[PDB]
């Protein structure tokens, strides 16, 4: 499922050692299925495959 309408934002980031940023993103896909997510620079890290 390809996606459109990429609207990401960050309500509260805190540069801690735990998951100190919960980024909220609204989108619009094409259909139903799995979707992988990935960070392309090494400044940040994600906990969800």
């Amino acid at each position: 499922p390809s996606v459109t309408d990429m609207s990401c934002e960050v309500p509260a980031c805190t540069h801690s050692s735990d998951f100190g940023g919960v980024a909220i993103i609204k989108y619009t896909a094409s259909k139903k299925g799995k979707c992988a997510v990935h960070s392309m620079t090494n400044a940040v890290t994600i906990r969800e495959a």
Partner: protein
């Protein structure tokens, strides 16, 4: 016969007196520093807000 100015009736800043024991209440001057320590249980993340 000449007690005159009672401190109940002549108190500056509108304080009142009360006896046994002596105590002056409501001396409206100055300002109170007050601190509070509180854990994260009563708060909640913006992901619930």
């Amino acid at each position: 016969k000449e007690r005159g100015a009672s401190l109940q009736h002549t108190a500056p800043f509108g304080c009142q007196i009360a006896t046994n024991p002596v105590r002056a209440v409501n001396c409206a001057v100055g300002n109170i520093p007050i601190s509070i320590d509180i854990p994260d249980a009563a708060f909640t993340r913006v992901v619930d807000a």
